[PDB]
Amino acid sequence: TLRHIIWGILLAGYLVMVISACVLNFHRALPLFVITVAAIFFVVWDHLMAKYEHRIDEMLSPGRRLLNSHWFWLKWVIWSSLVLAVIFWLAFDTAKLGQQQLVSFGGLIMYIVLLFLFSKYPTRVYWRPVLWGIGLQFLLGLLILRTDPGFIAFDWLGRQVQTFLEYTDAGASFVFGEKYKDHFFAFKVLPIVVFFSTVMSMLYYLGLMQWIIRKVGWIMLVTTGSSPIESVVASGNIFVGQTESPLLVRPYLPYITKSELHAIMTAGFSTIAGSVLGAYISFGVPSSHLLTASVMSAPASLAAAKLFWPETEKPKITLKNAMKMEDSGNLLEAATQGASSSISLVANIAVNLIAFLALLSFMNSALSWFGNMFDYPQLSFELICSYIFMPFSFMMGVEWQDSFMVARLIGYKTFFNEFVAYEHLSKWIHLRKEGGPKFVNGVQQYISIRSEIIATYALCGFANIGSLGIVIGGLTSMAPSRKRDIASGAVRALIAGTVACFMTACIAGILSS
Amino acid sequence: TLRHIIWGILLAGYLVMVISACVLNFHRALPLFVITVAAIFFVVWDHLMAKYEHRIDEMLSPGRRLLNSHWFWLKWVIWSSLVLAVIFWLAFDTAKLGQQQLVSFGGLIMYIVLLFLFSKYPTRVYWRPVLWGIGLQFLLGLLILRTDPGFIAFDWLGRQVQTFLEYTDAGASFVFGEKYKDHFFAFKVLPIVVFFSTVMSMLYYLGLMQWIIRKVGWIMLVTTGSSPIESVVASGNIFVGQTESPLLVRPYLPYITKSELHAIMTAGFSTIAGSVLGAYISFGVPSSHLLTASVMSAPASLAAAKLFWPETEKPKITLKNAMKMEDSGNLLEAATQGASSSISLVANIAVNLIAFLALLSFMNSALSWFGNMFDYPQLSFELICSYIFMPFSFMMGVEWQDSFMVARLIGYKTFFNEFVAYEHLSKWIHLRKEGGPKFVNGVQQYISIRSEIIATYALCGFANIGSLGIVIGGLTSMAPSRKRDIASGAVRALIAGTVACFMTACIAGILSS
Amino acid sequence: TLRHIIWGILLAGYLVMVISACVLNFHRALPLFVITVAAIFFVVWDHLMAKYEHRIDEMLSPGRRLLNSHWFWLKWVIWSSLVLAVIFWLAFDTAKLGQQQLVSFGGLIMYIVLLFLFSKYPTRVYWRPVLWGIGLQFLLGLLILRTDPGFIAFDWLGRQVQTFLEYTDAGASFVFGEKYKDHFFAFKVLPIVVFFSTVMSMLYYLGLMQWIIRKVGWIMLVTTGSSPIESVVASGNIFVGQTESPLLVRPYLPYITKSELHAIMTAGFSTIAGSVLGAYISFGVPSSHLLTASVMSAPASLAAAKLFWPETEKPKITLKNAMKMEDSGNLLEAATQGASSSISLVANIAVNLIAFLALLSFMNSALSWFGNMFDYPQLSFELICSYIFMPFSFMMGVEWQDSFMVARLIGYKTFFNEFVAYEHLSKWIHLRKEGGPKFVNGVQQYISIRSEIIATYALCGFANIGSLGIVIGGLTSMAPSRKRDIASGAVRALIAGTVACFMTACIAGILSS
User: Fold this and answer.
1) Which of A19, A277, A283, A511 is deepest in the core (most CB within 10 A)?
2) Would you list the DSSP string of C470-483?
3) Closest by alpha carbon to A283, among A188, A402, A404?
4) Selection from B338, A430, B471 nearest residue C469 by Cα
5) Which subunits sit against C, judged by 3+ Cβ pairs under 8 A?
């Protein structure tokens, strides 16, 4: 009762400091005007969330009883109003590009069919997530790709991440000298993994990382109707990695079902971490699209995993987000516990990219003299992955000249880890920013403006076949009483995870121009 | 009974080898003449410590019975003889510098008052450590700062550490090539942390590190009268770090009191390790002063922590130094176990200085555009820490032109780890060794000869708010039955630790010239 | 019953792919013709190993009953036929070099005598391993050093490892930039340790590493008659390191005898890993000889450890190779679990070579001013190790001009780890490949063609006194119920391990020219 006088008037003195700089020079005051008004607004929308929780059931009830009675009529309307909304909107994507963008919508159905025919419970599909999970990310993607204020936001939210890429050049220029531009990956990019792992833990300590997960999750919960753990983990995988998302719900992991656990694991493969998020940007990948792909992969993780292995028995656990809590004492412990957790994280990244990129040049040279058998060198591992994933590359709506070159990146990401796929993307990002020739002799040498947006989304996921060993061991270290359930669902989780990356990837193909 | 014939005559053959080179060319024979005579002498002073332990109680008793009877007179003399000794000596520090050196003595009382008014047991203070703990380091500091043979010793003991800074350039030039001068921190300085962690474990295996702790501790024990574990840990923190000092007494950690545990933790924050001791010297910090600060911080750790959280119940454990033992089989295991323990030690240092130095340039740029709100960039994190710790900087006797610039280092050391504070000190050490301008436009650009001695001592401690997370987890991993006692004393340990660094820092301010 | 139709006809489609490229251009088709015929052949020799296991006892029995009856005659023949075979062959090594190659054979007996006089069970020696364990590696060494098709094999098998040294330059040029030739050890050589630790685990997952151990082991088992765990571990130490070889038999480790455990530990010291095998080649060491030394050290490990601490009680365990099994799910988990196990492996190597190479230049400078006492600098640690191991260096048949310079490498390998010994060898490999002067002033400056083959074999082992701390802790972490047995045998294991390296080293001295 005594502490809040100090902390309150100081934060009320902050409200003095907001309105002080709001009066003079308001145009430079715009980010502080927007945030602190919303910072007042979201506390009000959360303090009245619990205080008016009585009226939350009292005001939602007289319509919902009428909505259940009108569901005899509404299920013939709302299920048919959206189909008319899609087909009318398919008259207005053809003006963008009739060639490939119809194939992307033709592929988005085909990825559903590739999961529905190969799901293990086809008749047990509860279609309310798996249609609306595409309906979320499409309504999410049409806001933040197609509409202009949504493009202004995630560009600016993308570009201010790019300023954090500069803030680590105080640390990486110090621990590694002024020559840190030499040896550019381990000395620039791996400090970004350290600095984002120390920001992610500060935001997790301050509750801000727990807060967005409870807001993105609850929006994704009620609209999809999944289990209340799964909406936390799938929305949690936007920010934290594949091995830290079930750590959010780790007291509740032995109690979930096999499909509630499958969709936890799939959402781990379907997205990237906020830790390695700035590693990918520093290669040269567009930050605005890669942030976009992480957000849309959370409803895609529901729309793929609840379609590929649906839930039957009972979602036994409710209200695990409010039970989800921290730990660290102060802020600078959490900035240290975030950095000391980045010890093994930048080490396992660095030795995989020694291990896996050498297994390129092994397999690019082993299959070279295996191809030299038939008078045919230029038979490489990269050429074989192009023709294996020529179906999935063209299915998500890539031009035929670039469908062969993007299918290397799916082959890089599925077999090897996705860092192999992103700088080999960023060798082709950076090559087209330079004004360069397309075909030097016959090599495609870059992709496009267009399908580098799609190949950004097709890789935004940890869904290599290598992380199946880490996620099994990561989940068995949490819930060892379900080791039979975790290991049996992991192989089903990659394909549901890789398609969940692709279901976001074709939505850019629908929304390309 | 058979082995000591081999080991004895070989070491007696060493005594032949001493006196051989002692006869011819004695002037080059001085370090071997001094050590091996003392090596005979300290074995004699320890073999007769146990053999004449009967007379140790028989000869100390007839005076101590008279000393207890004369304590009716001696407590009016010795408590008043020292006060007359101080005030007469305050007539002979003013000739050095009357401006700031009186403020340092004015600050040393003020740091006592800042702990005594904010101790939790003010009436329960047993003043025999907390006055003599300043009386030790002052008698220790006046010997090794003021007097000329004490200056010759710790300069030479400082300069021969600087030769170990060269000995790692066989290893760091090999593991990291001849280009190791590029990327100077991780490739020169972090091998010094490895090479000093492998020397510290060899000296711990050979007993030499256990021996100085039993000699510095027992001198600090009887003169302060603290608990016999605490005099081991506080003197142990001279050499080993904050997370290895309670490992010395780890079978005895669940049995200590809450204040015996507080002063264990505070001495961990109040000092530096011998591991990172050569990291600090390689930046450019004077080695003779930094070794001096580590020695004086052990009685300062008693004089601060027994003042800030005194002991009431009962010191239940005696003779834990002789119970303190190892482990490793041979010497070269201990040179490996010291190097393999330096895996996480140079890794957690390297990622913190990526994490924390980026959180400078985050907060130096976040508060820049927060200052740009009020038409005021150059509002940085560095400027705010200057005015927050302008009290403590000027209190320990720094010039007003340099009190603002040194208070950044306290702000660097309290919030971030002290490696941030030392190279930002060594940017200003190295800038004044070059003949440079003081004010370029208005920036102070270095400090002085004088207050770089004080700022050396104000930072010789692990007392950041970040290590409160490591020391809690480091002590809970040892004595998990006292987790409530450890976590409640850690916040009290930093302030008692940061002042214990400062109580050494003002003594250089008294002894500056 | 359904899966083998897919996997069979695909591998039968591979047999189509073999014979397709076998018809046209057979000269380029030679490695694929040799392997896949043998790949058919070894499956046939293993499918008929179990199917005709009934006739394996039915056809071996009518001769063995006659062999036991003729052993009254055969033990006077075969024990005397080999002695006549040796002495006749000692008439035909003198034509190669009568000076030093007789000393190598004179040393090979002397190493037996140095183990037999200092074994703890001299009367309990079962001489059937310890004579035939030299008889294996001599028959193994005469095939692959002396004979010309055996030289063609291990050169080509050596040179195709040298191609894997190039394959890591896709990974090390990426994680560490194009400037990775700068800082040549940690940025080129330590990725080779990563890439070979990720190949070794893939070959262990595919069974190919388990297969050669079951073939080299069973050949070494029946011919030596050791315990069936020990023939797995000693042959296993050809490939995996000292801390992963008892991990092969870790469910069976509390049941072995003290001498079965001694020879497990000794074989760990006597050989090198396949992990650090390409680290040694990248320094400049000849790959064909270093692969040769790893193969011959497995029978040398039997011939030394069963001689130095023989087995008395009972070999209680049989058929542990077939019980030896994995783990990892797919291949790319095992390529990740091999890389993530190389985290601590390249870190403990990198900090030891910071720790140990600095303890050269410490001891090279501490003994320098200890030598300056007697007007004698150039008294170094390197000079003392030359005269300590002048016996063992000349005993294995090195020229007297080079016996002093090679004995530094034994002193480098016994006290410090063998990476110190190999690049200080490869400073002298690389110096003689350049056309250089032998004596600049008096320094030998390289060795020879000849004794760099011997010094390659004298170092192919983990038998430093530093790894006694890792192997004790590595075995106690596996079988903690035998900690008294492991710690008592480790000191006996180094000397039996260092001689087992030397027993291979003198065989090159016999086979030098």
Assistant:
1) A277
2) HHHHHHHTT-GGGH
3) A188
4) B338
5) A, B
The whole-angstrom separation of Cα C485 and Cα C260 is: 11
> Using a CB-CB distance cutoff of 8 angstroms, which residues of chain C are in contact with residue B29?
373
- CA of B177 to nearest chain C CA: how many angstroms apart? 4
How far is B184 from C122, CA to CA, in rounded Å? Answer: 57
Cα gap B391→B405, rounded to integer Å: 12
In this structure, are residues A172 and A180 in contact, taking their beta carbons and an 8 Å threshold?
yes
For A171, which residue in chain B has the nearest alpha carbon? B354
Question: Comparing C-alpha atoms, which of B232, B141, B128 is closest to residue B503?
Answer: B141
CA distance B225 to B246: 19
- Compute the distance between CA of residue A441 and CA of residue C157 in angstroms, rounded to an integer: 37
* Cα separation, A262 vs A308, whole angstroms: 9
Q: What are the structure tokens assigned to C201, written together?
A: 């685990």
| Best CA proximity match to B315, nearest among B225, B249, B220 | B225
DSSP C265-286: HHHHHHS--SSTHHHHHHHT--
Backbone angles phi, psi at B313, to 5 degrees: -65, -75
- List phi, psi (to 5°) of B505: -75, -30
The answer, for B29 touching chain C at a CB cutoff of 8 Å, is yes
CA nearest neighbour of C82 among C123, C139, C129, C126:
C139
| Binary contact (B415, A168; C-beta < 8 A) | no
The Cα-based distances of A165 to A192, A196, A212, A287, B199 in angstroms read 7, 9, 22, 11, 38
Q: What is the spatial distance between Cα A418 and Cα A357, in angstroms, rounded to a whole number?
A: 11
Nearest beta carbon to residue B183 from set A29, A180, A340: A180
- Give the E-state strand segments of B106-238 in sequence order: none
B52 DSSP 8-state letter: T
Chain breaks in chain C following residues, C–N > 2.5 Å: 326
CB A234 within 8 A of CB A259: no
Q: What angle do CA A361, A362, A368 make, to 5 degrees?
A: 85
Residue for token pair 């507080």: B262
B156 contacts B287 by C-beta, under 8 angstroms: no
Smallest CA–CA distance, residue C473 to chain B, in Å, is: 10
In this complex, is the C-beta atom of B328 within 8 Å of any C-beta atom belonging to chain C?
yes
Q: How many residues does chain C have?
A: 513
The residue extents of the domains of chain B are 3-59, 101-513
Specify whether the CB–CB gap between A119 and A125 falls below 8 A. yes
Minimum distance, in Å, between the CA of residue B370 and any CA atom of chain A = 8
Q: B413: which residues sit within 8 A by CB, 6+ positions away?
A: B420, B421, B458, B459, B461, B463, B464
The residues near B346 (Cβ < 8 Å, ≥ 6 apart) are B190, B193, B194, C351
Interface test with B, best of C193, C243, C357, C419 (most B CBs within 10 A): C357
- Backbone discontinuities in chain B, residue before each (C to N > 2.5 A): 326
Residue A72 C-alpha, separation from nearest chain C C-alpha, in angstroms: 49
Neighboring chain C residues of A362 at a CB cutoff of 8 Å: 164, 167
Q: B-contacting residues of C 437-496, CB under 8 Å?
A: 464-470, 472, 487, 490
Which tokens go with B50?
């146990």
Assign 3-state DSSP to chain C and report helix, strand, coil percentages, each to 5: 75, 0, 25
Nearest to C32 among A352, A361, A373 (CB): A373
CB B398 within 8 A of CB B100: yes
Chains that touch A (3 or more CB pairs under 8 A): B, C
Q: At what angle do helices A331-340 and A190-205 cross, to 10 degrees?
A: 140
Q: What span, in angstroms and rounded, lies between the C-alpha atoms of A462 and A422?
A: 12
